[model samples]
Target: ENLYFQGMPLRLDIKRKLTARSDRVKSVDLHPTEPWMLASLYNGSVCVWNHETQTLVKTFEVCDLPVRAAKFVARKNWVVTGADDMQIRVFNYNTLERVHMFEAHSDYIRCIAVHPTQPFILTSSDDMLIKLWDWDKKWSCSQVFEGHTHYVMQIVINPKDNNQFASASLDRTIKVWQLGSSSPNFTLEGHEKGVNCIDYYSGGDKPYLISGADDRLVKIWDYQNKTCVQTLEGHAQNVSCASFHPELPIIITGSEDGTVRIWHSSTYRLESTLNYGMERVWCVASLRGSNNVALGYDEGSIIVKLG
Candidate 1:
C-alpha cells in the first residue's frame, strides 16, 4: 500500500538556490536527517549550506586541485572527497578544516563512498584500484581490491550490507565485491560503453541495482538472479550520475545532455526529464524521507523539493 509512483508528476520546483563558485559543481548531496547540503566544485571548492538560513556555512579549497566527487558522510558537517590529486580527504564542514588526507589512488580519484554503518571509506580511481580505509584505525588502508581493467568512474555501497559494494568503470562493467575479497564477487555486464554510475536499489525486498553508462543507457539489474531486469533509454548523451531515492520508488539521473531525468522504479518509465540551462549536470542526489532532489550543475546549484 505504501508503494507509489514517485516520478509520475514530471515536475520539479526549485525550492532553494546556492551561490555560484569560481567553477561548476561536480558533486552535491543532501543530508539524510537535516536540511543542509554539501556541494563540491571542480576547482577543489567545497561548500556547506543550510537551507533554513539560505547561507553558505563554510567553504574550503583543498590544495586547489580538481574535485571529482564529494559527499556528506555525517548528519550535518563531515564530508569525504576524491580528486585529481589522486587523494582522498575528510573534512570538518563547519570549520572548513581538512581533517585528514592521503594518496589512496594512482591516478585521478573519481569516486568516494562511505560505509553505511561504519567508518570505512571506499575509493575508486583511474589506476583501476579500489581501496577500503577505516577511519577508526587512524585512516589506514585496510583492504585493496583490484579487478577493473580501466578507470573506475563511480561506486555505491550497499546500505543493506556494509561489507558489500558495487562499482562502475570505463571498462564497461559493474563489479561487486565483499570487504576483504581480493577479487570481484560478480561482474554485471550489459552496457556497450563505459559504466559511469551505479546505485544500489533499496526500494523493496529484492536485491536490485541500477547503472548509467556512456552508452547513453540506464539499466536496472537483479542481483539475486544476476540478470538485466530493465533498461531505461532517452538520454541523448553520456549519463554522468544516477541516484536511487532514499525513501521513494524512484530513481534520478544527471547527464552531459544538460538534463536531469527521473524514472519510476516500479515501472522503469521515463517519468520526468529535468532540464535547465546548465552546460553539464554532473551529479544528482535525493533527500531522505521525501521525493526531493539536489543537482550539481555546470553554472550553479539548485535543490528540487516538493513545494
Candidate 2:
C-alpha cells in the first residue's frame, strides 16, 4: 500500500508524524506560505502541524459535531470549519483562538471556501443552498444563492480571480457563479450522479476545471467554454476527490477504491497510481509549490507524498 515512483519522477519521504485522532480524518490543508498544515478530524478536533519537524504544533477542539470540511482563508492566518452541528467556527491560526461562531446552515454544512480577496466565505449544505458570509461583519449571511435541488457537496473559489467560483452538488451538476450575479454564470453538466469535488487549474490560456463524481470518473472541463474537454476513467468505485498540481499540467484523484491516481492534465491519461491499502481517501491536496500532496484517509491518517 506504500506509494512508489520509478525514475524519481515522484517520491514520498515522511516529513513528520502527525498526531492521530480518535475518528477519521476528513480533510487536510497546507498553509500557502508557511510550513504549517491543518487536519480536520471527524471527532471534532483540528490539529495544526509543523512539516519541518513533523511535530504537532497545536490542537484546537473546534466542534462537538462531525466536521464536514475545513478551509484556510486566503490570508493563511485564519481557518474556517463547518460541521453537522449546523455551525461554522472561525479561528485565528496563530493563537488557535475561536474568533467567531455562527449558525449558517440549517442542515449539515458540507463545504466551505474563502474568497480570494474579498471578505467573504462561501458555504454549501444539505439545505441545498450556497450562503455567502461577510466574516468582517459578525459572520452574517450577506447573500444566498439557491439553484441545486440536492445536497451541495463542494465549493471552491478561483485562486487567480475572486469574482468567480464553482460548486458541485448531489444534483449531478457543477455550477459556476460570478460574484454579485443573481444566477449562476454557467453550469457544467454530464455526470450521471452527484459531483463530489471540484478544483480549478490556472495553467493554459483559459482556466480549467476538474471534477470527481459518484460515477467513478474524473472529468476535465474548459472553464471558458463551459464544456467537457476530457474524462479520465478507471476507478473501480466512486471518485471522492481530485486536485491539480500547482504549476504543472498534472491531475491527482482519490477514491473509495483506496488508490490515488495521477494523470496528465493536458491529455487526460493515467500517469501513476498510489495505493494505500484499505483506507478510503476522502480528500487529496497538492502542495502549493511542489509535486508533493497530502491525502486524508478514512483510517484517521494523513499521508504526505513527494515526487
Candidate 3:
C-alpha cells in the first residue's frame, strides 16, 4: 500500500539519530514493546538505545569480528546476535550477561529470526544452510535444512503460523519450510541473482510471498502455486533488504543505490521513494507493528522515522 497505506502522504523526519558505531550498522530492530532498539554494527558491536531517553542503555562487544545482526527476544528477556565470527550468541537483557553461545555456522551467520508465537529461533548462514534452534531446549540445534547452493541471506516466519517459515538465498531461490520437516516443502526460483531478503503476506484469503534480490527485481509469489505472480522493477542497483509492513499493506525496500522504495500492494505502483540522501541504505525495519521504521546506514547514522 506504500504511500496509500500511510494515509496517502509523503513524510520523512528523524525522530532521533545516533552515532551507533565507528563502522557501518548492518541491522536495526525494535523492542517488541518498549521504545528501545538494537543496532548490530560491522565492527563487532551491538548497542541498545532507549528512544525516550535518547541514550544508549547497553553496549556489548559480543565479538571481535563484525556482527551481522542482533535482535531482542520477547519482553527484552534476551538479546541475540549473529556474528561474522561464525557464531550465534544470546545474552540476558536485564542481567547484561552472556546466557549462551554456539558455533552456529561453518561460515558467517547472516541473519537471525525468531518466531512470533514459538520458543524457537532460525539462523541462516553463508554456508548455504538454514538451522533451526529450540529455545526451550537451551538453544540446541534440532534441524538442518539443506538445498541452497550459496549463502542463505534471510529467514522469515509466518506471523500467523509459527510452524511455517521461508528463507531467501544467494542461490537465487526462496524456500518454504515447515517446522516439522528438515527440508523445504517448496523451492521457488525466478530471480536471476542472489536473493537478499523476503517476507510473507497472509492478509488476504490467499497468502503471498515477496522477495527482493541483487537481480534488481522484486517478485511476488502465491503460497500454493508456481514461482512468481508479479515482478517489480525500480531499483537501479542491488536490493539490500525488503519487508512487508506488519500492520499495513505496504511493501518497502532498501537498495545499494541509496534509496528506500515503497509500493502499493494491489496497484503495484510506485507510492514513494523514501530516500533520506543516505550514502547507502543497509536496512529498513518496521517497529512494534506500526507505520514507523528504523533505518541503518553505511555512514553509521541510525534513526527511527516514518515509513
Predicted structure with the largest TM-score when compared to the true one: 1
Candidate numbers sorted by TM-score from highest down:
1, 3, 2
| Model 2 score (lDDT) | 0.80
For each candidate in turn, the TM-score is: 0.91, 0.90, 0.90
Give the per-residue lDDT of model 2 (tens digit) for 1-307.
1235323233324342343433677788877776777778888888777776777888778877778788888474788999899889888888888888988889999888877777898989999999999877877888888788899989888887778889999899999987787588878999989999999886546578899999998898888877898878889888989988785667889999999888766556566787765478788776667644667777755545444
Give candidate 2's error at residue 92 in angstroms: 1.8
Q: What is the C-alpha lDDT of each candidate?
A: 0.81, 0.80, 0.80
lDDT of 2 at 1: 15
lDDT of 1 by residue, 1-307 (tens): 1237333353444454544433788788787776787888877888877766777777777748878888887743578888898878788866777888888887998888877678888888999988998888998988988899999988888878778999999999999999979799999999999999998876557798889898999988887788998888889899998877776656888899998887766767676776777778788777657655778888877776743
| Residue-level lDDT tens digits of model 3 in 1-307 | 3554545543434354444544677888888677777888888988888866778898886987888878889654888899988888888888889888989999989898887677788999999999988878877898998888999988888876778889999999999999888878989999999999888775756588888899999899887875598998989888888877666656778888888887766657777775666567777677645655777778764555554
CA deviation > 4 Å runs, candidate 2: 1-22, 74-76, 303-305
Q: Rank the candidates by lDDT, best first.
A: 1, 3, 2
Q: Ten consecutive residues with minimal summed lDDT in candidate 1? A: 1-10
Question: What range of 10 consecutive residues in model 3 has the weakest lDDT sum?
Answer: 9-18
Q: With candidate 3 superimposed using the best TM-score fit, by how many Å does residue 22's alpha carbon deviate from the native? A: 4.9
